[PDB]
Design a protein around this ligand. Structure first.
Ligand SMILES: *[C@@H]1O[C@H](CO[C@H]2O[C@@H](C)[C@@H](O)[C@@H](O)[C@@H]2O)[C@@H](O[C@@H]2O[C@H](CO)[C@@H](O[C@@H]3O[C@H](CO[C@H]4O[C@H](CO)[C@@H](O)[C@H](O)[C@@H]4O[C@@H]4O[C@H](CO)[C@@H](O[C@@H]5O[C@H](CO)[C@H](O)[C@H](O)[C@H]5O)[C@H](O)[C@H]4NC(C)=O)[C@@H](O)[C@H](O[C@H]4O[C@H](CO)[C@@H](O)[C@H](O)[C@@H]4O)[C@@H]3O)[C@H](O)[C@H]2NC(C)=O)[C@H](O)[C@H]1NC(C)=O
Lengths: 199, 208
């Protein structure tokens, strides 16, 4: 077989209310006896959840809940898998500079406020490292009809991205406050928002 | 461990703008110094064509040769879904390697394009960002660039395209503008080339 190790979501590690996880997905019915051991800076940990997946097209999935600060301070996380000789797989957050994002919600054209539904754009600029989470709300309630671009390497070595939220011309005209909510390690309490409305 | 072959499409800009020269390219990598003679043959809907420019390059990173064959093509032979095949011959190969490419069959839909002024809150800076917002297009291939007074600008960055919830694609391009340029009233244009657009082109301008 061959294994792939994935990082926690950056929003989960920066938000103490959330549950970050390191995930080990191992590729390759014959035998379903495969043990997955886990290590943080080479000390074995026994708290992972593993559930099995027989694929018809196997892959087993083991998720290690992690301490937020272990990821942030750069520890690695390793998964050793068993079922030849066993496969190792490591992962960590590398060290480097931090620059806070600048966040801007852009007013939409008028010709768009005409349509039954139109897009609000949030522009996020000047940040390092590139990992970032961007989502939206409406009157403080979680909103989901948005899409983010991938981050792009800008000329000064920082990153930028945009987020686009779809809105109902009816919800806008009733005075709903829309906000772009951005989570990044360079921000106060790891979060910042920008608001726009009809108003 | 012997030669391998990659085929590449024309730039979308070069097939959509009749004045430019699109090409289909076949690249052979890991050609040995001991067997440098590579014959590439080219077929358009399985009829052989003989006009490809084929040259060899020495690749110093790892002591290999690279053979690049660029077939110039008709803009409409790409747009109408003709198949372009390269066939590569070399004495290190048991039998020829063949690669085929074509413009895939699928939907067409023009992008909505808006250029947006800088954020109110960026106007305390030495430089500002203009945003070209490009929405609702199929297929995903697109070219986007900028100009100031017809000079091409180079200080812009495009995001990759993103699959939207309706199945179309969107993208943004951000241009950096010096405060003084913006203030003296220079005209900034976002130009977008897509097969959906009447005359394959739209250009949106902004200033003030
Ligand atoms: C010996 O060394 C060779 C040097 O390699 C470099 O590799 C790095 C690791 C560094 O060490 C660097 O210093 C080295 O110089 C090495 O050759 C490479 O080997 C690879 C094969 O193992 C091969 O990988 C494939 O690349 C495909 C993409 O290729 C393009 O993108 C790269 C940049 O990412 C670029 O470097 C290449 O030259 C290709 O660039 C494109 O070229 C086309 C054709 O010219 C351009 O299109 C034309 O453009 C003109 C004008 O310029 C007109 O527009 C015309 O009409 C067009 O036709 C195009 O613009 C250009 N793109 C870019 C971005 O520049 C991948 O597609 C491919 O992956 C596919 O397939 C694999 C497997 O089949 C799958 O795994 C993938 O999922 C995917 O489906 C794969 O990655 C490299 O391209 C090749 N590089 C070069 C320079 O030749 C060699 O292997 C080494 N050998 C040994 C034994 O070690």
């Amino acid at each position: 077989p061959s294994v792939f190790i994935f990082p926690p979501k950056i929003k989960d590690v920066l938000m103490i209310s959330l549950s970050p996880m390191v995930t080990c997905v191992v590729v390759d019915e014959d035998d379903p006896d495969v043990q997955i051991s886990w290590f943080v800076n080479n000390v074995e940990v026994h708290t992972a959840q593993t559930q099995t997946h027989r694929e018809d097209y196997l892959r087993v999935v083991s998720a290690l809940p992690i301490q937020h600060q272990d990821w942030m301070s750069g520890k690695e996380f390793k998964c050793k898998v068993n079922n030849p000789s066993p496969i190792e797989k490591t992962i960590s957050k590398p060290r480097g500079p931090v620059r806070a994002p600048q966040v801007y919600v852009l007013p939409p054209p008028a010709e768009e406020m005409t349509k039954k539904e139109f897009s609000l754009t949030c522009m996020i600029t000047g940040f390092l490292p590139a990992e970032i989470a961007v989502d939206w709300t409406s009157n403080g309630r979680t909103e989901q009809n948005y899409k983010n671009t991938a981050t792009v390497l800008d000329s000064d070595g920082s990153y930028f991205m945009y987020s686009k939220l779809r809105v109902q011309k009816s919800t806008w005209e009733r005075g709903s406050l829309f906000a772009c909510s951005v989570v990044h390690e360079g921000l106060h309490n790891h979060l910042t928002t920008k608001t726009i409305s009809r108003s």
